[PDB]
Amino acid sequence: PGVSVRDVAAQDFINAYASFLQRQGKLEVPGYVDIVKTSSGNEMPPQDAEGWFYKRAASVARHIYMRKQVGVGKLNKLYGGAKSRGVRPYKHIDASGSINRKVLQALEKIGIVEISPKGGRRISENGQRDLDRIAAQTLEEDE
Amino acid sequence: IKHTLDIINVLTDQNPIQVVVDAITNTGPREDTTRVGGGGAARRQAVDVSPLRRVNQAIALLTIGAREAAFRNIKTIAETLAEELINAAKGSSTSYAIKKKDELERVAKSNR
Amino acid sequence: VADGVFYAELNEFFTRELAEEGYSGVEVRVTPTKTEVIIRATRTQDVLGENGRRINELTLLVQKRFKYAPGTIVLYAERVQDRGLSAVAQAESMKFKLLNGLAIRRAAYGVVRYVMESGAKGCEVVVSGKLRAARAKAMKFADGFLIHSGQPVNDFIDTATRHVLMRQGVLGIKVKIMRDPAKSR
Amino acid sequence: GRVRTKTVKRASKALIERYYPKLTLDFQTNKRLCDEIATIQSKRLRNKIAGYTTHLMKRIQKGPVRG
Amino acid sequence: IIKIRITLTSTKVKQLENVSSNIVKNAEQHNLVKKGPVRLPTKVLKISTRTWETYEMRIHKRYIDLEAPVQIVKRITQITIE
Amino acid sequence: AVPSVQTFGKKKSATAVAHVKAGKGLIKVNGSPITLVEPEILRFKVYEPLLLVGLDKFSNIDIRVRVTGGGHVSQVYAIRQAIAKGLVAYHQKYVDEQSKNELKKAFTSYDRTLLIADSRRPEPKKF
Amino acid sequence: QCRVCSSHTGLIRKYGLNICRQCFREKANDIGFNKFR
RNA sequence: AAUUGCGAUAACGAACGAGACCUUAACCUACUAAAUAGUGGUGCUAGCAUUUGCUGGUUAUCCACUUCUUAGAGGGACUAUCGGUUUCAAGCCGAUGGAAGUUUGAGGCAAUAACAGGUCUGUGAUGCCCUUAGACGUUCUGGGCCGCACGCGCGCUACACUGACGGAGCCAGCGAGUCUAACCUUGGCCGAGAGGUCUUGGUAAUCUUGUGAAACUCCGUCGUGCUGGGGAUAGAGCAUUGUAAU
């Protein structure tokens, strides 16, 4: 009966954990958040202009806790959008690597994600503890 | 369909599945016309269409009327389809398939 | 002595490359750094050809193909008959089969089967003498098509007689094989 | 139109004309009968012959058919 | 004592099963420890050729582990050439 | 050893292998709860092999589902079929035959897909 | 480019074997892609 | 389904036909068998609540197995059976059992009767214009093969609110991959991106790969307005392959 990330919903976990990271604020947030869209297969920057980066980091940390390890190209593949090419149809386009690198440096600087000797970003046991605790608090929101 | 059954609940029809079945019943053209040869000037003769085809025909007319009504307006597919099923569960001639059922049956009665 | 892998690979190369030059078998002996592969042969005038042919052709083909310089290996030839067309080798084989406990019928079927698989127009094996009985018996085993009169007897059919000594008595093997007249050459 | 080929008709008819009482109304024993009693090279054409023996045995136990 | 894995491939099943069974019989008759013939998936290499048609090829693969000295491995590898 | 039954369940190249062991009454699909299926619409479909028999049939068993292949609808039908198959196979091999017949009758009378594998495959396109 | 018998018409340019569809069905019984279905 | 058979009957035989031969599909918790596939138990190990548990890391920690992946052996289907229809015959149709019941479905295979159908860089004191100042052979540059009142046609993208945008979830399979070369690329840093850097894995069921594809699911922005649908056309720069991108 362990309260963990494996029990909560996806979008609720991302909303809650992004809210905890917003109220903390103790991460590495760049200055091109208001400037740069998350992928070249987009027209407009994300609507949560002051807070889409925390949503991005919450999605990343949730995607890391559930599996062995991730990379930058894997998270570029995960975000991938159907891009219109005008008169040409939609095609799959991977996202920017800079957002992945800065999210993983922000979550590695706080001590949640860590580089694993298979060349991969894995969840730290402190990050395991923190995500399981906030998932427990997300479950306690539901009482 | 789930949104539509919710709407038919909130529009004071406690049995939305019965609203669906009554719209199936009250919008089925019993008899229609076929285009016989007729000797050049091809008249149309009233045949008495099968009740399986009456079910097919009623569902087709309702989906066509709902797709006509929900296209090019703010009003959603669920609200238009619920409006059609409520105005068609009991014959009111403010829906689609009631009117076209009446048109097919009056062509059938005129052409027997 | 070279291995049977090399011998079977030359069998594979010859069976696909000497398809209409009469590749009967391969005799092979190895002296120090010289492997002598004698192509045992149906008809050898396909092998020798017009003024020296298939031996030079296959020698240069192995030197061009199997990356051999002239001087390492050597290719020889000998003139014999086809083992199936010849009544002598088939009579040796019939004597062999009768001396190893195989009866008249299965040995006759095997030898006639091998002759007809070789490519002879026909053959006949005549078996005489006594087999486990006092009374003597003779048995004809003919197949294909044979002729019995005239100058084509001297031209086309080979005959061989063998006295095969068994524990009871002696048997007379008479092998008569008709070679293909189109392949007379 | 599943018309039986000539080999199946003739073989099944011959197996019932000569070898009637061994054959039965059941396909699975007449199949083993056609396995044991005729040299059929393929299982499929043996099944063809055996089921046609089964059908003709169903027909002949009602009355004498022209064998 | 050398542990060598033999990876065999063929197009036809009967000669490949014959070669594998000969490996099994000969490595069993003089007490060699071994893994059984592991049968890889038959890969289906196809070409769509000019309606349209399809050309096919089945490729069958086995592999057998053996543990034997140099003499037995060399005689097995030489004799089993088919 | 905990008494467990290992049983497949397939839908459209989507294989969900189910491990029904003797446990607390715990159900997981791919290490995710049965409350959380990736489509919200198909959710009660996964509840269809559950409530068609009852809920006290489940407290004795810890249920595992691990899935390969398919799509979104295909995996849902695969996991609900695998739940039904693992449940009736547990109640066949360990529990008596009659309860297995009752569970298979309850599954068969509503949806025979939950016990019988499907066949709607994409045909070879007939060159 | 046909490097075998100067037969550019219908090269099969896949995998660099580069045989024309006329001569590819000449040499079809040497590689192994034959008629099954 | 057929000139396939029955039957009457100047009738009596045989061949190629056609059926038929080959190759495929589906069900096999009954075989036979596994570290280039997987599942479970079990060691070492990480987090969470602890009352037993959940999520896992661990190309050897061992075992079992093929339930799923896979190689075959076989098996099965032969219209099995029932009832209409049919000289109540070869057969057809409706229904049941069956993995499969329309010939379970497709394609290759001959013999006989048409192809000047398309060349062989073929041989023959072959016929015949010249025998060569011809380029037929070679080059080497730069423009073409794309040009535009228009006609014949196929496709892509739209005319949106069962929709566009902004997020999230992240579901497959067929393939394919480098040697005496620069293939497929994982990962890490830089860049808004394009891309770049540094390596690493895989000659392959192993790495790319679980190809985390797209459509799809959910939540917010939009509010019917050629609109936030559309993206044609055009400007500016920045990068990549190519000798050379006008």
UniProtKB/Swiss-Prot annotation, chain B:
Leader sequence segment: none
Covalent cross-link site, Glycyl lysine isopeptide (Lys-Gly) (interchain with G-Cter in ubiquitin): K90
Coiled coil: none
PTM description: N-terminally acetylated by acetyltransferase NatA.
Top-level taxon in the UniProt lineage: Eukaryota
Location of this chain's protein in the cell: Cytoplasm
Family indicated by similarity: Belongs to the universal ribosomal protein uS7 family.
Biological role: Component of the ribosome, a large ribonucleoprotein complex responsible for the synthesis of proteins in the cell. The small ribosomal subunit (SSU) binds messenger RNAs (mRNAs) and translates the encoded message by selecting cognate aminoacyl-transfer RNA (tRNA) molecules. The large subunit (LSU) contains the ribosomal catalytic site termed the peptidyl transferase center (PTC), which catalyzes the formation of peptide bonds, thereby polymerizing the amino acids delivered by tRNAs into a polypeptide chain.
Subunit structure, as described in the record: Component of the small ribosomal subunit (SSU). Mature yeast ribosomes consist of a small (40S) and a large (60S) subunit. The 40S small subunit contains 1 molecule of ribosomal RNA (18S rRNA) and 33 different proteins (encoded by 57 genes). The large 60S subunit contains 3 rRNA molecules (25S, 5.8S and 5S rRNA) and 46 different proteins (encoded by 81 genes).
Stated name of the protein: Small ribosomal subunit protein uS7
Residues of the full protein shown: 114 to 225 of 225
UniProtKB/Swiss-Prot annotation, chain C:
Subcellular localization(s) per the UniProt record: Cytoplasm
Predominant cellular place of this UniProt entry's protein: cytoplasm
Modified sites of kind Phosphoserine: S86, S118
Modified residues (Omega-N-methylarginine): R135
Molecular-function GO terms, alphabetical: DNA-(apurinic or apyrimidinic site) endonuclease activity; RNA binding; structural constituent of ribosome
Any one annotated GO CC term: nucleus
Keywords assigned: Cytoplasm, Isopeptide bond, Methylation, Phosphoprotein, Ribonucleoprotein, Ribosomal protein, RNA-binding, Ubl conjugation
Domain KH type-2: 10-81
Location of Phosphothreonine modifications: T33, T59
Top-level taxon: Eukaryota
Position(s), cross-link Glycyl lysine isopeptide (Lys-Gly) (interchain with G-Cter in ubiquitin): K95, K121, K130, K140
Gene Ontology biological process: cytoplasmic translation; maintenance of translational fidelity; nonfunctional rRNA decay; ribosomal small subunit export from nucleus; ribosomal subunit export from nucleus
Protein family per UniProt: Belongs to the universal ribosomal protein uS3 family.
Function: Component of the ribosome, a large ribonucleoprotein complex responsible for the synthesis of proteins in the cell. The small ribosomal subunit (SSU) binds messenger RNAs (mRNAs) and translates the encoded message by selecting cognate aminoacyl-transfer RNA (tRNA) molecules. The large subunit (LSU) contains the ribosomal catalytic site termed the peptidyl transferase center (PTC), which catalyzes the formation of peptide bonds, thereby polymerizing the amino acids delivered by tRNAs into a polypeptide chain.
Extra facts: Present with 146000 molecules/cell in log phase SD medium.
Entry protein name: Small ribosomal subunit protein uS3
Species of provenance: Saccharomyces cerevisiae (strain ATCC 204508 / S288c)
Complete-protein stretch covered: 12 to 196 of 240
Swiss-Prot record, chain D:
Role, per record: Component of the ribosome, a large ribonucleoprotein complex responsible for the synthesis of proteins in the cell. The small ribosomal subunit (SSU) binds messenger RNAs (mRNAs) and translates the encoded message by selecting cognate aminoacyl-transfer RNA (tRNA) molecules. The large subunit (LSU) contains the ribosomal catalytic site termed the peptidyl transferase center (PTC), which catalyzes the formation of peptide bonds, thereby polymerizing the amino acids delivered by tRNAs into a polypeptide chain.
Keywords annotated in UniProt: Cytoplasm, Ribonucleoprotein, Ribosomal protein
Organism field: Saccharomyces cerevisiae (strain ATCC 204508 / S288c)
Full protein name: Small ribosomal subunit protein eS17A
Subunit structure: Component of the small ribosomal subunit (SSU). Mature yeast ribosomes consist of a small (40S) and a large (60S) subunit. The 40S small subunit contains 1 molecule of ribosomal RNA (18S rRNA) and 33 different proteins (encoded by 57 genes). The large 60S subunit contains 3 rRNA molecules (25S, 5.8S and 5S rRNA) and 46 different proteins (encoded by 81 genes).
Domain of life: Eukaryota
Family, per entry: Belongs to the eukaryotic ribosomal protein eS17 family.
GO biological process: cytoplasmic translation; ribosomal small subunit assembly
One annotated Gene Ontology cellular component of this protein: cytosol
MF-aspect GO terms: structural constituent of ribosome
UniProtKB/Swiss-Prot annotation, chain F:
Phosphothreonine: residues carrying this PTM: T68
Subcellular location: Cytoplasm
Annotated SUPFAM superfamilies: Ribosomal protein S5 domain 2-like
Chief localization: cytoplasm
One Pfam family recorded for the sequence: Ribosomal_S9
Covalent link Glycyl lysine isopeptide (Lys-Gly) (interchain with G-Cter in ubiquitin), residues: K28, K45, K57
GO MF entry, a single one: RNA binding
Gene Ontology CC terms: 90S preribosome; cytosol; cytosolic small ribosomal subunit
Described purpose of this protein according to its UniProt entry: Component of the ribosome, a large ribonucleoprotein complex responsible for the synthesis of proteins in the cell. The small ribosomal subunit (SSU) binds messenger RNAs (mRNAs) and translates the encoded message by selecting cognate aminoacyl-transfer RNA (tRNA) molecules. The large subunit (LSU) contains the ribosomal catalytic site termed the peptidyl transferase center (PTC), which catalyzes the formation of peptide bonds, thereby polymerizing the amino acids delivered by tRNAs into a polypeptide chain.
PANTHER family per the UniProt record, alphabetical: RIBOSOMAL PROTEIN S16, RIBOSOMAL PROTEIN S9
Subunit structure: Component of the small ribosomal subunit (SSU). Mature yeast ribosomes consist of a small (40S) and a large (60S) subunit. The 40S small subunit contains 1 molecule of ribosomal RNA (18S rRNA) and 33 different proteins (encoded by 57 genes). The large 60S subunit contains 3 rRNA molecules (25S, 5.8S and 5S rRNA) and 46 different proteins (encoded by 81 genes).
NCBIfam families: PRK00474.1 (NF001749)
Recorded family membership: Belongs to the universal ribosomal protein uS9 family.
Name of protein: Small ribosomal subunit protein uS9A
Protein's organism: Saccharomyces cerevisiae (strain ATCC 204508 / S288c)
Gene: RPS16A
